[PDB]
Design a protein around this ligand. Sequence first.
Ligand SMILES: *[C@@H]1O[C@H](CO)[C@@H](O[C@@H]2O[C@H](CO)[C@@H](O[C@@H]3O[C@H](CO)[C@@H](O)[C@H](O)[C@H]3NC(C)=O)[C@H](O)[C@H]2NC(C)=O)[C@H](O)[C@H]1NC(C)=O
Ligand SMILES: *[C@@H]1O[C@H](CO)[C@@H](O)[C@H](O)[C@H]1NC(C)=O
Lengths: 93, 96
Amino acid sequence: DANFGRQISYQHAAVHIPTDIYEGSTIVLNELNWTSALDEVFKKNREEDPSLLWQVFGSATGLARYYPASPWVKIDLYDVRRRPWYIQGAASP
Amino acid sequence: VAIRTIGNIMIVTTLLQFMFACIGVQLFKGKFYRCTDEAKSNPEECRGLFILYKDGDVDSPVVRERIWQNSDFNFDNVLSAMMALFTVSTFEGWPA
Ligand SMILES: *[C@@H]1O[C@H](CO)[C@@H](O[C@@H]2O[C@H](CO)[C@@H](O[C@@H]3O[C@H](CO)[C@@H](O)[C@H](O)[C@H]3NC(C)=O)[C@H](O)[C@H]2NC(C)=O)[C@H](O)[C@H]1NC(C)=O
Ligand SMILES: *[C@@H]1O[C@H](CO)[C@@H](O)[C@H](O)[C@H]1NC(C)=O
């Protein structure tokens, strides 16, 4: 796609689970079920404003679900809970 | 002949080792388990992958599997306890 450096798909939303968190645990799978309803809202936002960049929900359990789906970019040390944009919305100065 | 005349002591020490093996089974039955990384302390948490920092360096990480594995010498049943106590009585690997 243009205005996007990667190959992306608008049919669904990708999920990033950090290496130090095991997918398939009870906490993660439960978070992977009720967050599956966000994909409809992801598509609705992109319909009205097609010039919309990544929309991401940073779960407090570690996993981050972003739209549109695109493959993730050595080892992976990414963690959504330590990102600068997560920390400012999780608390105050 | 020397073996025959000393069989009394061997039976006594074998019985003592058996008693100590039973006591060790009662004391450390299944408690020797550990995870691959010293951060997860039950089998339900010792699953998946984890980041290992080689030689304690924070700038040299490497991805490794999580395995909930038993000790090589343990006190699970009577035979394992007897083997572990034999290794201890040989004064080898007993501090570990
Ligand atoms: C969390 O996981 C649950 C387990 O899959 C989901 O619950 C299931 O959702 C299915 C998809 O709708 C349901 O199937 C059909 O649901 C519609 C809606 O009412 C109806 O046609 C029928 O109830 C059903 N059709 C059938 C069974 O042929 C399941 O009924 C439903 N429950 C189960 C499988 O026990 C949740 O949707 C999911 N949470 C979210 C937010 O998606
Ligand atoms: C987006 O912003 C523009 C102005 O920049 C505005 O006209 C428009 O109504 C807004 N919404 C959409 C869906 O374009």
